Amino acid sequence: MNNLHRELAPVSDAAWEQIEEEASRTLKRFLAARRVVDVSDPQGPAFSAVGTGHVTRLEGPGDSVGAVKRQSQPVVEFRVPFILTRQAIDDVERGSQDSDWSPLKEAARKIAGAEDRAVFDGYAAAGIGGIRPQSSNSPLTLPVAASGYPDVIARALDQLRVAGVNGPYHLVLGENAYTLITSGNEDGYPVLQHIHRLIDGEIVWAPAIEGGVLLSTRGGDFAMDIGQDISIGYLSHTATHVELYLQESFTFRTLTSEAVVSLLPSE
Amino acid sequence: MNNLHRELAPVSDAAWEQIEEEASRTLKRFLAARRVVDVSDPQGPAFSAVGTGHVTRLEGPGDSVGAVKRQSQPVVEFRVPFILTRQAIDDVERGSQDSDWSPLKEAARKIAGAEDRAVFDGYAAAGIGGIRPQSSNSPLTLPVAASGYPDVIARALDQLRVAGVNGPYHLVLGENAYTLITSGNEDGYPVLQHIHRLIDGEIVWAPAIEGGVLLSTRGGDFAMDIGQDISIGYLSHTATHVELYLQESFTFRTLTSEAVVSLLPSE
Amino acid sequence: MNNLHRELAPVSDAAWEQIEEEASRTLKRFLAARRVVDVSDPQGPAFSAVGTGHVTRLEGPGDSVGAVKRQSQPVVEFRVPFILTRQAIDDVERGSQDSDWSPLKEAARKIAGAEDRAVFDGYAAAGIGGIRPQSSNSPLTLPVAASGYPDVIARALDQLRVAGVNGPYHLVLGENAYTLITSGNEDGYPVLQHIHRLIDGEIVWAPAIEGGVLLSTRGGDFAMDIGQDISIGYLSHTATHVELYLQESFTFRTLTSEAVVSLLPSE
């Protein structure tokens, strides 16, 4: 028995299995940063901080004794609660195949968006700098028309090459940029084909962010330390409802600031 | 001996084999919904209903006894009769290779169209909601010109992604939409190539429906329960004719309403 | 873990065992229809309907396509709640042998009476016709005095024989009829001996119904389809009480209406 008091929830095994399957599907659909950043294996519930290797000079304890304090980044925990009606839970065992998991899907969307925004744009309260605001390269603005995308991608790739970064290059685009680049052109220009000739993979769809980002996936530039992966826990239940939550525990660090170019949304 | 009183029909074995081959060919050509929906193995002649897992509160039998009634969807049977002239049947054994099976082909077309319309647009009398009218996403209107098809397909794909549905994405188009998208453009735009870059398969041709539909084929969203597959039975014969019928037995349910976007015919 | 959230109940194993033993004893004492009707093995929580084999003509889907809908009888669920004081539950482990299970016995009586009344007199809301109202034979009125019982039993047996039904013949009597026929006569007439010479078993005592019924137990005339047998589930608990319920899931059909004669209470 762990802190996720699952056995105390009035939820049958079949309902638990269906809920877990739905949560996994929605999370894989909505999670974007994990596709481009180095994600470690879960460290456990006792994982609290990651040391940065740097020190801070302190006032000495006394006679000719010098003191330095080690620096570390703390781990932040995200929790999003949702409520189920207990009727879907009871119907799963009766044989229902269309039980309503909309609150679970909304909670998954919220937690995935929070994680993606923390990784990309940063979360000041948790001490997470963010991939984009912590970039030493000059940001590039995306064009209104999809025809100008190859030029901007080429300039960003040139920025990476001049900075000296190697390895495969991947771009993550927001919802608007992704739909604009996938809709196509009215002049018959194979802009998608040119983009795929330039890039080293598939465009990553990120509903949580705006604009985009081009980054190298050689490894060792963006570290996501995971203590607890996204899991489902139980809070309380009523005669007609059950309250659950989605919880994750992680920290993120940007080690190389030259391996990333941030693309700003079109104006 | 079963309810299809085949042995009572004045039809030779060679004629039966040719008729079955023609019916199978025409049915595979005309059946479209089975390519995109989950089709189960036949359940048998005694398959009458499929339970939905839900209940309805009833007035109690008496002193402090509560009652709920289980809900199920009944199975509907489709039968289409046709007439053969007995001259083709007699000529098959004499060696004919061009016997007239036009009534059989027309009956196959009718029954396939009825099944496809029930699955896609719904059949109220049998309790079948239908794929398109039971969609929670906003329907999209197809453009008059094939050049605008990639944009509409991209918007529908974005709707699926925002709803959180995963898996391969397939589009089914009516006859007009299919012929318009396959005829091409007068500006040399590779619209078919762009469409095939966006989609996860081949466009499904559906002569029975108008407009189109984009849906995910991950599995578990559209259930077709089959009790009796399409089979040939005998009714009566005259000195110069034999009356047969094509019969099927099925029910259909749409379990996930967010995994489908309906495309409306161009105006 | 199933829909009967037993493990969430603050009830020890010894208390659970005693409660189950008491419930089984009281249910075997009070259940009467199961002694004379064909009872199937439990079908499971997903059992929702039983097909009758009949069809209903529908309005056609379109051009020369005929449609029929299969007919089925839904399964009804009965639930009766009761409350225990938690003091008996705590005392069972302390060694109590006279714990108060009166609410459980009352709930068992209520649910058994509801089931028996649904089987014999019918339950319109659940679609259960009932054994007695769905009888094609002419009902017979019981006499006020036990001396006239053999004559009525003989007439009912003659009705069965003329209808052509075979097999053992059993009579189920209400509480008043049973006590009247067992009290005896003041003239020394062995009416019970004559009744047992006529009948093919022991008189079934039915506290839930009035009058009586004479029916053949050859098999295949009265079908009780059981999805979930009577079981104990947990709802909620207080600091001084625990709320449980008795739940069953079944449907009943009378297939042969000539194998039953209904005896009406004496006037």
Residue numbers in the entry:
A (entry chain A), B (entry chain A), C (entry chain A): 1 to 267
From the paper:
Encapsulation is mediated by specific cargo protein motifs known as targeting peptides (TPs), though the structural basis for encapsulation of the largest encapsulin cargo class, dye-decolorizing peroxidases (DyPs), is currently unknown. In this study, we report the structural and functional analysis of a DyP encapsulin system from a Gram-negative pathogen – Klebsiella pneumoniae (Kp).
Heterologous expression of the Kp two-gene core operon (KpDyP_Enc) in Escherichia coli BL21 (DE3) followed by protein purification via polyethylene glycol precipitation, size exclusion (SEC) and ion exchange chromatography, yielded readily assembled and DyP-loaded encapsulin shells. Based on gel densitometry analysis, on average 12 copies of KpDyP are present per 60mer KpEnc shell, suggestive of encapsulation of two KpDyP hexamers per KpEnc. To investigate the structure and cargo-loading mechanism of the DyP-loaded encapsulin, single particle cryo-EM analysis was carried out on purified KpDyP_Enc. The encapsulin shell was determined to 2.5 Å via icosahedral (I) refinement. The asymmetric unit contains one individual protomer that exhibits the HK97 phage-like fold consisting of the canonical axial domain (A-domain), peripheral domain (P-Domain), and extended loop (E-loop). The shell contains two open pores at the five- and three-fold axes of symmetry, with a diameter of 9 Å and 3 Å, respectively. No open pore was observed at the two-fold axis of symmetry. Due to its size, the large five-fold pore represents the likely access point for small molecule DyP substrates to enter the interior of the compartment, as suggested previously.
